Symmetry: C2
Subunit: 89 residues, 2 copies
């Protein structure tokens, strides 16, 4: 339907926001396979695209446990990766 | 019977705090070997043993990239795991 090659697991963010969030994690997922890196680029884009600052943790076998403390927190697992997006706004 | 068996990679929290954080991460590791689990166990105690809210990420192949702050954002890698402790105080 709209890409989204992930597998959410916990997203305290608006649905549509969770779909665009995953795709963005994908952008960094396809451009780079470096957990940290992917998270870096993303955060930058999500911030300039939405409004700084997005606390994201992308991996492939970790265990994120942050407090969204907002409404822009989405967790999911891409084809072979995981993204933990959440701002401290 | 000694924790702190991690490998910090980026910390912005009080020294004794980053040390206690690692042990707390280890505590969750000894009680459970599940990323998410370890993360929860940590944030849980750290939140009720320091001052809410602690956002930590425990994994061994992920990539954390968030805008830390306050003074409780420690990052390390245990014997075979990693932890990303950071609040939004």
């Amino acid at each position: 339907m709209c890409d989204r090659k992930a597998v959410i697991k916990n997203a305290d963010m608006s649905e549509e926001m969770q779909q665009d969030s995953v795709e963005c994690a994908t952008q960094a997922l396809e451009k780079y396979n470096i957990e940290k890196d992917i998270a870096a680029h993303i955060k930058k884009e999500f911030d300039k695209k939405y409004n700084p600052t997005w606390h994201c943790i992308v991996g492939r076998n970790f265990g994120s446990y942050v407090t969204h403390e907002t409404k822009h927190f989405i967790y999911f697992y891409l084809g072979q990766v995981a993204i933990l997006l959440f701002k401290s706004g």
